[PDB]
Design an enzyme around this catalytic site. Structure first.
Site, PDB file in Angstrom:
ATOM      1  N   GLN E  11      64.151 -25.724  58.864  1.00 15.36           N
ATOM      2  CA  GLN E  11      65.090 -27.275  57.610  1.00 15.36           C
ATOM      3  C   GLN E  11      65.355 -28.275  58.142  1.00 15.36           C
ATOM      4  OE1 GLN E  11      67.172 -25.113  54.669  1.00 15.36           O
ATOM      5  NE2 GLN E  11      67.875 -27.730  53.454  1.00 15.36           N
ATOM      6  N   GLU E  66      58.769 -22.347  54.902  1.00 17.08           N
ATOM      7  CA  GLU E  66      59.326 -23.233  53.137  1.00 17.08           C
ATOM      8  C   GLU E  66      59.059 -24.707  52.878  1.00 17.08           C
ATOM      9  OE1 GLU E  66      62.022 -25.325  51.475  1.00 17.08           O
ATOM     10  OE2 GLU E  66      62.201 -23.747  49.725  1.00 17.08           O
ATOM     11  N   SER E 135      66.948 -25.219  63.919  1.00 18.25           N
ATOM     12  CA  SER E 135      68.595 -24.525  63.663  1.00 18.25           C
ATOM     13  C   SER E 135      68.773 -23.066  64.118  1.00 18.25           C
ATOM     14  CB  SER E 135      68.688 -24.736  62.739  1.00 18.25           C
ATOM     15  OG  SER E 135      68.624 -24.139  61.539  1.00 18.25           O
ATOM     16  N   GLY E 139      66.505 -18.615  60.143  1.00 19.77           N
ATOM     17  CA  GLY E 139      65.791 -17.223  60.647  1.00 19.77           C
ATOM     18  C   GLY E 139      63.955 -18.053  60.764  1.00 19.77           C
ATOM     19  N   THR E 140      63.053 -18.090  59.733  1.00 16.60           N
ATOM     20  CA  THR E 140      62.170 -19.194  60.949  1.00 16.60           C
ATOM     21  C   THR E 140      62.402 -20.138  61.672  1.00 16.60           C
ATOM     22  OG1 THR E 140      60.045 -20.144  60.013  1.00 16.60           O
ATOM     23  CG2 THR E 140      62.752 -20.803  58.745  1.00 16.60           C
ATOM     24  N   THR E 174      77.763 -20.955  58.088  1.00 22.66           N
ATOM     25  CA  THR E 174      76.515 -20.865  56.019  1.00 22.66           C
ATOM     26  C   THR E 174      76.491 -19.718  55.672  1.00 22.66           C
ATOM     27  OG1 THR E 174      74.596 -21.623  57.514  1.00 22.66           O
ATOM     28  CG2 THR E 174      75.992 -23.435  56.089  1.00 22.66           C
ATOM     29  N   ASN E 223      72.369 -36.055  61.237  1.00 21.83           N
ATOM     30  CA  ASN E 223      71.143 -37.044  61.109  1.00 21.83           C
ATOM     31  C   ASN E 223      71.129 -37.635  61.743  1.00 21.83           C
ATOM     32  OD1 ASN E 223      70.165 -34.139  60.105  1.00 21.83           O
ATOM     33  ND2 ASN E 223      70.007 -34.838  58.440  1.00 21.83           N
ATOM     34  N   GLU E 249      63.656 -37.008  85.836  1.00 18.79           N
ATOM     35  CA  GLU E 249      64.468 -37.105  86.663  1.00 18.79           C
ATOM     36  C   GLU E 249      65.724 -36.795  85.865  1.00 18.79           C
ATOM     37  OE1 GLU E 249      65.517 -38.836  89.597  1.00 18.79           O
ATOM     38  OE2 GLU E 249      63.068 -38.406  90.370  1.00 18.79           O
TER      39      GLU E 249
HETATM   40  N1  LIG Z   1      73.244 -30.413  61.969  1.00 19.73           N
HETATM   41  C1  LIG Z   1      72.260 -30.075  61.255  1.00 19.73           C
HETATM   42  N2  LIG Z   1      71.928 -28.576  60.576  1.00 19.73           N
HETATM   43  C2  LIG Z   1      71.371 -28.493  59.945  1.00 19.73           C
HETATM   44  C3  LIG Z   1      70.565 -29.462  59.017  1.00 19.73           C
HETATM   45  N3  LIG Z   1      69.823 -28.617  58.044  1.00 19.73           N
HETATM   46  C4  LIG Z   1      70.130 -27.060  58.393  1.00 19.73           C
HETATM   47  N4  LIG Z   1      70.646 -26.711  59.145  1.00 19.73           N
HETATM   48  C5  LIG Z   1      71.481 -25.495  59.949  1.00 19.73           C
HETATM   49  O1  LIG Z   1      70.636 -25.151  60.069  1.00 19.73           O
HETATM   50  C6  LIG Z   1      71.275 -23.056  59.524  1.00 19.73           C
HETATM   51  C7  LIG Z   1      70.617 -22.225  57.984  1.00 19.73           C
HETATM   52  O2  LIG Z   1      69.265 -22.176  58.709  1.00 19.73           O
HETATM   53  P1  LIG Z   1      68.296 -23.650  58.141  1.00 19.73           P
HETATM   54  O3  LIG Z   1      67.891 -24.961  58.409  1.00 19.73           O
HETATM   55  O4  LIG Z   1      68.885 -24.324  56.547  1.00 19.73           O
HETATM   56  O5  LIG Z   1      66.480 -23.002  57.184  1.00 19.73           O
HETATM   57  P2  LIG Z   1      65.588 -22.259  58.579  1.00 19.73           P
HETATM   58  O6  LIG Z   1      66.315 -23.501  59.868  1.00 19.73           O
HETATM   59  O7  LIG Z   1      64.224 -23.509  58.435  1.00 19.73           O
HETATM   60  O8  LIG Z   1      65.870 -20.965  58.504  1.00 19.73           O
HETATM   61  P3  LIG Z   1      65.334 -20.226  57.337  1.00 19.73           P
HETATM   62  O9  LIG Z   1      67.187 -20.059  56.493  1.00 19.73           O
HETATM   63  O10 LIG Z   1      65.379 -18.743  57.676  1.00 19.73           O
HETATM   64  O11 LIG Z   1      64.282 -20.775  56.437  1.00 19.73           O
HETATM   65  C8  LIG Z   1      72.656 -24.273  58.712  1.00 19.73           C
HETATM   66  O12 LIG Z   1      73.583 -22.670  59.253  1.00 19.73           O
HETATM   67  C9  LIG Z   1      73.000 -25.166  59.280  1.00 19.73           C
HETATM   68  O13 LIG Z   1      73.965 -25.757  60.186  1.00 19.73           O
HETATM   69  C10 LIG Z   1      71.072 -30.581  59.228  1.00 19.73           C
HETATM   70  O14 LIG Z   1      70.183 -31.665  58.515  1.00 19.73           O
HETATM   71  N5  LIG Z   1      71.015 -30.772  60.238  1.00 19.73           N
HETATM   72 MG   LIG Z   2      64.860 -22.826  56.379  1.00 15.76          MG
END
Ligand SMILES: Nc1nc2c(ncn2[C@@H]2O[C@H](COP(=O)(O)OP(=O)(O)OP(=O)(O)O)[C@@H](O)[C@H]2O)c(=O)[nH]1
Ligand SMILES: [Mg+2]
Ligand SMILES: Nc1nc2c(ncn2[C@@H]2O[C@H](COP(=O)(O)OP(=O)(O)O)[C@@H](O)[C@H]2O)c(=O)[nH]1
Lengths: 132, 430, 300, 58, 434, 49
Positions: E11, E66, E135, E139-140, E174, E223, E249
């Site tokens: 995400q 997702e 991120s 998980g995913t 989070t 972002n 480089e």
């Molecule tokens: N910098 C930044 N971090 C993000 C953003 N969206 C989610 N995160 C980070 O991602 C973490 C949680 O994981 P998610 O990105 O929500 O979901 P995922 O990485 O796809 O993994 P799942 O939760 O299993 O679906 C949070 O603690 C955020 O720090 C974003 O738009 N910008």
């Molecule tokens: Mg996610």
């Protein structure tokens, strides 16, 4: 323009006196304005659908999003224009229970036909002008 | 599409589910006749979660009403929103349970459960990709606490990998309506601890206190308590059905909430709650929401978390809002309340954001917490159980169906073991 | 098939669609108006009724071949007076499009460009000059018998008793031509290359762009001051300039407010959002209604 | 001595459309993006690499 | 002649990709529909491919289990831009579980991802490398990032790989179970990533509050900042400048040893529209601000440790003599000191294209900008903090069943911990004078 | 008071059939009384009702 509407019962928003479903004149033009007539007697409510509504008859008024009937009681309220009662939405059906589900299983009755009587409270009269 | 199916039983279960469906139908803009009348397209994109499509464009809920006596379902069918449930989802007997766990779990439940198992299997194979199950019932009644939990056992045997949550309205000893309450409560909790992925404790006294002292409402009804329970139940799955900045499904909540397999008993709360006469005088902001969040005065369980330590906690925010203030508020409340948080799990709070607020409000908060203070009700229930059981009062009704004192004995064993481990995992230190 | 009830309707609708698709695939000389002129030869007495054999022969002459079941179904549907004869007039009343608004605007402006006198009618000889000069650069102004010689570019229309070409038949003929041509873009291409006129609206404001703009302006006010505030902050500009104290906003006033609050929207997008916001169509926005929409609205 | 008029009293903003010089070079939203002018790294003789005859050499 | 393939998983990856692609589209003048208005030769081949009729398909892929965010991408204002079949969506989320996304569910999606990557790469015959966004604490995202890195490292081999990964914040976060998959992903990426870049969120929060004067920023602003950073890094591949540098480089002037490939990035200036006019914005002062520790987008304090490599890129109307004067001032100041075995470690690039301000954004219009990428030994503190969290979690075997029950053996934790301890040893060992 | 108690004409009904656009009275029979609205009193809500 102002429309008469209602929104589902909430403990946050319940009637000041009746504590039941609100009716309000609001600027909302959404689906809450959807009001429908219904013929009074239990036996013919279903079959009276699609028939013209004639003035001066005892009718029922029901909301579409909630399927609640509008009615009033001897519930006291005070405002500028003297002493007035309350209008709200509520189901004043008769209390005794009937086995609609088991009648369904046997096959004697179908849901669209009603089985529970409603008291005289729920009645409303449309009044037209006497002379043209 | 990752949809969930609803099964409710007993008088209390039927009452909870009836209003839960009305609330969800209202939020999705579905009329009692089943025709969509929403405003934006966001209300229809994920409607398959709770509703199945039919001819004419109408929708039907995927809920199963299960019981022994047709009185409660009989009454609820005639009320508003009674036309949504398709007639095949009603199942009932001709005898009744008599508030007897033995009769509801060995004699009548065993012979009746074939049809409800068949219908739930049919619906489960019907759905595209099943996500999980939710149950709503009472631990003080007979038919619910027995036959619903037997269903729980059977469906867990049939589908081991799916997530399962239960909303159990466990009754209190301050004002209880049943004398055989501790017996079937202990039996139900013993049977449920080995099969329920999540447990959602509900107490009637807590709801009475909240509605009287926060809503300031002098003459509430069970409808109001049903509405609070329905709002709480809907709050958990809001980001599942609607877009948000942080999506968090039921499995994610589970994995972030339970550290150990047998500690899955949670207490919940909802925010904000205000009287009508005070709405104009309150400014709805993140600090106010998070202050109302963690108040022990706000919880829906009789247990006081201040007597224990929060093992884990989670936060479901609804409504458009940035994540900064949420982040420092969580960090701030964790720093100033470190004494009430168990130490060896730093940053034991989950946060998730959904951008669709409840209708009629701009911001909302759903709180679910796993804390060690929940053991108080376990000890009190066990004490009442042993207090009656030393004299073998009312045991003849239970032994009249082949049950003997053994099952009582290991049920007490399981409760003792649970209340014992909830102490070790509140005293354990790094 | 199994045309018991609305089976009739679903079975005739497919024939309508296949006729439309066949004409569109032909895309060339075959025009729907040719059917109207070709039936009168078989009509003989202009009774408006034709038997099944003549109807089949006429359709086969055009080149639209159908099954026997189809022919019986069309006879059943369009034999309104149940004499066993299909009404070709009733047939041709169907399978005709009402025309897209964009195409209507283009054809109306094309007609108005020629009809500078604005009398509502056009001399057939006048169209010939344009129809020829668009095609040649060395046609030169004056031909010997130009009227009859270049009247061949025209008379696909018809003329009134006065002889002037009417706007209604103009748009009707181009509608009938725009049946094989079901393309807005390619239809406009043909019309504009034929008439040598290049003008059209660049685009209409789209709903997703409206949602993006409202989301941006909706988020921007959150960043300032504190959470509970921004309502007083929005009210305070209204107090700063609402002199009459009536409580009504205007287009230019909203433009000013957006310029103050770091939001320079296009004039066109600002008109689009203004029109979306107001249903009264009075060109005035109630401040409280605007505040409720921007701040207290569960839906995006 | 009256303080002239109440209108003479200072206001945070005034009916001047461009109240502050801060916002007169800000980017106006719905404007079409502008193609860059003759500014990018020289690339003209490397086209005989995306010339499809480059491979299959023998 | 240059193309780079961008991968957005998770995400966070998708949310960053949306913002960066919007900025790229605005930079190259494309409309949201993907059409060129009728307006010196392009060189947008790096990011887009021209279909032959006007449409320009981006060279990107979006992966997630997702479907909510991908559905929003297919529903929003950019429906007509992205190629419909290069936006791959799964069925069920990994639910913050690394093993779910690495062993059970991601197997049936990695094949489709590889097929689409090959189908995208066959067009690119002057391909430069791969950029990946994810991120770590998800998980995913983490699981698919690890799996794709493992598969690509053997499928393509020597192709350069850069990963702009979002590590969880030390004091705030989070989720609660992020350390496990964080160290798992770091161990996976150690030997599969050529370059890694830190993207924690609290530091950019600090940047926004101090400079941009935004009391409650959201993920959109974050972002946007990341998009500005990546645009500044990539602008050398599509805009002429005095000194041109390619992604090739980077491993030569930023990676002294293959084990150490984690670099931290700075950006300057960060100035709002209300702030731009009262600032002269000198190149020397923007460079001084860039080296200031609080101007870092990571909570790593470089004055804790040594400096190994220092690569700065300028865009605008800078002049090399002022560049050299500013570098001399940086070397003169005593608060910044490098490692003993690096006499010179400065790599400077210059580009003529000034940054472009985004409508609806908050950065101001400027004539000079700098992006920064550096190697510091102080980076070990975040790894040590993650180690402390993992020890506190694994001491009592919390959450361990949630990883055991879906097919990954118990021994992964021990080897990952040993690997991270080895990395901590290497970071100190590369910091002793000869 | 004067704006509340203004005069008005009810539209006549032909053959006793209600049709859209008329001005008619709504009466509760159980109260034997006609419904009216009080605009000046404001309900407790963010929306004006
Ligand atoms: N910098 C930044 N971090 C993000 C953003 N969206 C989610 N995160 C980070 O991602 C973490 C949680 O994981 P998610 O990105 O929500 O979901 P995922 O990485 O796809 O993994 P799942 O939760 O299993 O679906 C949070 O603690 C955020 O720090 C974003 O738009 N910008
Ligand atoms: Mg996610
Ligand atoms: N909150 C709430 N609780 C209810 C309601 N109806 C019943 N209960 C609870 O249910 C308990 C009795 O359960 P019972 O009807 O015997 O369960 P059953 O045997 O499964 O039907 C009481 O202690 C009530 O507190 C309701 O409408 N709302």
């Amino acid at each position: 323009p102002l429309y008469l509407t209602s929104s589902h019962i909430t403990p946050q928003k319940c009637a000041k006196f009746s504590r039941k479903q609100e009716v309000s004149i609001s600027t909302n033009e959404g689906i809450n304005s959807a009001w429908c007539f219904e013929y009074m007697d239990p036996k013919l409510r279903y079959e009276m659908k699609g028939q013209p509504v004639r003035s001066g008859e005892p009718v029922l008024i029901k909301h579409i999003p909630t399927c609640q009937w509008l009615a009033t009681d001897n519930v006291q309220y005070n405002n500028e224009f003297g002493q007035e009662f309350e209008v709200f939405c509520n189901s004043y059906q008769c209390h005794n229970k009937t086995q609609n589900l088991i009648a369904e299983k046997v096959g004697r009755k179908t849901i669209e036909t009603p089985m529970r009587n409603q008291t005289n409270q729920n009645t409303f009269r449309i009044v037209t002008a006497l002379y043209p | 599409m990752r949809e969930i199916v609803h099964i409710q039983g007993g008088q209390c279960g039927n009452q909870i589910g009836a209003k839960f469906w009305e609330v969800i139908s209202d939020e999705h803009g579905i009329d009692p006749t089943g025709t969509y009348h929403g405003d934006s397209d966001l209300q229809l994109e994920r409607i398959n979660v709770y509703y199945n499509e039919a001819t004419g464009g109408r929708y039907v809920p995927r809920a199963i009403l299960m019981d022994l006596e047709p009185g409660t379902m009989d009454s609820v069918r005639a009320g508003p929103f009674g036309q949504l449930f398709r007639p095949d989802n009603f199942v009932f007997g001709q005898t009744g349970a008599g508030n007897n766990w033995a009769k509801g779990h060995y004699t009548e439940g065993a012979e009746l459960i074939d049809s409800v198992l068949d219908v739930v299997r049919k619906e489960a194979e019907g759905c595209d990709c099943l996500q999980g199950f939710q149950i709503t019932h009472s631990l003080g009644g007979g038919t619910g606490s027995g036959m619903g939990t037997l269903l729980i056992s059977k469906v867990r045997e049939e589908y081991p990998d799916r997530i399962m949550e239960t909303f159990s309205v466990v009754p209190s000893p301050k004002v209880s309506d049943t004398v055989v309450e501790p017996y079937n409560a202990t039996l139900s909790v013993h049977q449920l601890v080995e099969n329920a992925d999540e447990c959602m404790v509900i107490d009637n006294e807590a709801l009475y206190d909240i509605c009287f002292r926060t809503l300031k409402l002098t003459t509430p009804t069970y409808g109001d308590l049903n509405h609070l329970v329905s709002a709480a139940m809907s709050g958990v799955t809001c980001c599942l059905r609607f877009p948000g900045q942080l999506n968090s499904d039921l499995r994610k909540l589970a994995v972030n909430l339970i550290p150990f397999p047998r500690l899955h008993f949670f207490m919940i709360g909802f925010a904000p709650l205000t009287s009508r006469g005070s709405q104009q005088y309150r400014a709805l902001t993140v600090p106010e929401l998070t202050q109302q969040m963690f108040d022990a005065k706000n919880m829906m369980c009789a247990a006081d978390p201040r007597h224990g330590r929060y093992l884990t906690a989670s936060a479901l925010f609804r409504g458009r809002m940035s994540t900064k203030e949420v982040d420092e508020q969580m960090l701030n409340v964790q720093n100033k309340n470190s004494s009430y948080f168990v130490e060896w799990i730093p940053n034991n709070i989950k946060s998730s954001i959904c951008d669709i607020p409840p209708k009629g409000l701009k911001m909302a908060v759903t709180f679910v917490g796993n804390s060690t203070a929940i053991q108080e009700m376990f000890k009190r229930v066990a004490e009442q159980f042993t207090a009656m059981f030393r004299r073998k009062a009312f045991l003849h009704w239970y032994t009249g169906e082949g049950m003997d004192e053994m099952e009582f004995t290991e049920a007490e064993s399981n409760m003792n073991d649970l209340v014992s481990e909830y102490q070790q995992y509140q005293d354990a230190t790094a | 098939m199994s045309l018991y009830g609305v089976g009739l309707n679903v079975q005739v609708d497919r024939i309508k669609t296949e006729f439309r698709l066949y004409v569109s695939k032909q895309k060339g000389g075959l025009n729907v108006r040719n059917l109207r002129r070709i039936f009168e030869q078989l009509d003989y007495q202009q009774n408006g009724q034709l038997n099944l054999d003549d109807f089949k022969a006429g359709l086969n002459k055009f080149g639209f071949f159908l099954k026997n079941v189809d022919y019986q179904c069309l006879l059943k549907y369009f034999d309104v007076e149940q004499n066993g004869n299909v009404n070709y007039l009733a047939f041709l009343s169907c399978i005709s499009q009402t025309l897209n608004q964009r195409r209507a605007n283009f054809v109306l402006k094309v007609f108005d460009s020629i009809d500078s006198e604005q009398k509502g009618a056009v001399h057939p000889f006048s169209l010939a000059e344009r129809l020829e000069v668009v095609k040649n650069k060395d046609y030169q102004i004056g031909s010997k018998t130009r009227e009859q010689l270049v009247g061949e570019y025209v008379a696909q229309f018809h003329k009134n008793q006065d002889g002037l070409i009417t706007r209604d038949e103009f748009v009707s003929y181009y509608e009938d031509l725009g049946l094989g041509i079901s393309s807005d873009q390619h239809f406009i291409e043909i019309l504009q290359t034929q008439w040598g006129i290049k003008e059209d609206d660049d685009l209409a404001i789209t709903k997703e762009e409206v949602k993006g703009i409202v989301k941006t302006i909706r988020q921007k006010l959150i960043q300032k001051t504190k959470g509970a505030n921004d309502e007083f902050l929005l009210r305070k500009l209204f107090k700063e300039f609402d002199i009459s104290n009536s409580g009504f906003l205007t287009l230019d006033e909203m433009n000013a407010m957006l310029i103050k609050l770091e939001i320079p929207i296009q004039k066109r997008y600002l008109n689009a959002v203004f029109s979306q916001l107001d249903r009264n169509h009075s060109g005035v926005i109630e401040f409280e209604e605007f505040v409720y929409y921007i701040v207290n609205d569960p839906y995006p | 001595y009256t303080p002239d008029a109440l209108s003479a009293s200072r206001t945070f903003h005034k009916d001047t459309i461009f109240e502050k010089d801060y916002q007169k070079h800000i980017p106006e939203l719905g404007s079409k993006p502008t193609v860059p002018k003759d500014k990018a790294r020289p690339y003209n003789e490397f086209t005989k690499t995306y010339d499809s005859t480059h491979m299959k050499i023998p | 002649m240059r193309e780079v393939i961008s991968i957005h998983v998770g995400q966070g990856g998708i949310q960053v990709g949306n913002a960066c692609w919007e900025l790229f589209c605005l930079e190259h003048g494309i409309q949201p529909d993907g059409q060129m208005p009728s307006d010196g030769d392009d060189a947008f081949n790096t990011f887009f491919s021209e279909t032959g009729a006007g449409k320009h398909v981006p060279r990107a892929v979006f992966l997630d289990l997702e479907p909510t965010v991908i559905d929003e991408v297919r529903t929003g204002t950019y429906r007509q831009l992205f190629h419909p079949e290069q936006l791959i969506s799964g069925k069920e989320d990994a639910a913050n579980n690394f093993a779910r996304g690495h062993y059970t569910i991601g197997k049936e999606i990695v094949d489709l991802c590889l097929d689409r990557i090959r189908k995208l790469a066959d067009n690119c015959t002057g391909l430069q490398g791969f950029l990946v966004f994810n991120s770590v604490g998800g998980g995913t995202g983490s699981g698919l990032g690890s799996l794709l890195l493992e598969r690509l490292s053997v499928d393509y081999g020597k192709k350069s790989k850069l990963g702009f990964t979002i590590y969880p914040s030390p004091q705030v976060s989070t989720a609660v179970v992020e350390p496990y998959n964080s160290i798992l992903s770091t161990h996976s990426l150690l030997e599969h990533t050529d370059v890694a870049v830190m993207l924690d969120n609290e530091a950019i929060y600090d940047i926004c509050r101090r400079n941009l004067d935004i009391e409650r920023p959201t993920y959109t602003n974050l972002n946007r900042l990341i998009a500005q950073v990546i645009s500044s890094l990539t602008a050398s591949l599509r805009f002429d400048g005095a000194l041109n540098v390619d992604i090739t480089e980077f491993q030569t002037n930023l990676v002294p040893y293959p084990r150490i490939h984690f670099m931290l990035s700075s950006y300057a200036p960060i100035i709002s529209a209300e702030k731009a006019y009262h600032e002269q914005l000198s190149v020397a002062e923007i460079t001084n601000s860039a080296f200031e520790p609080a101007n870092m987008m990571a909570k790593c304090d470089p004055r804790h440790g040594k400096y190994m490599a220092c690569s700065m890129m300028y865009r605008g109307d800078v002049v090399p003599k002022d560049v050299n004067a500013s570098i001399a001032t940086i070397k003169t100041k005593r608060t910044i000191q490098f490692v003993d075995w690096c006499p010179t470690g400065f790599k400077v690039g210059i580009n003529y294209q000034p940054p472009t301000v985004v409508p609806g954004g908050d950065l101001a219009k400027v004539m000079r900008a700098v992006c920064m990428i550096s190697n510091s030994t102080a980076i070990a503190e975040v790894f040590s903090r993650l180690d402390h969290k993992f020890d506190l979690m694994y001491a009592k075997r919390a959450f361990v069943h949630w990883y055991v029950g879906e097919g990954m053996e118990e021994g992964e934790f021990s080897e990952a911990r040993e690997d991270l301890a080895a990395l901590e040893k290497d970071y100190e060992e590369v910091g002793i004078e000869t | 008071l004067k704006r509340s108690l203004g005069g008005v004409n009810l539209s006549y009904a032909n053959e006793g059939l209600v049709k859209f656009g008329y001005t008619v009275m709504i009466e509760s029979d159980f109260m034997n009384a006609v419904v009216a609205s009080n605009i000046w009193d404001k309900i407790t809500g963010t929306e004006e009702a």
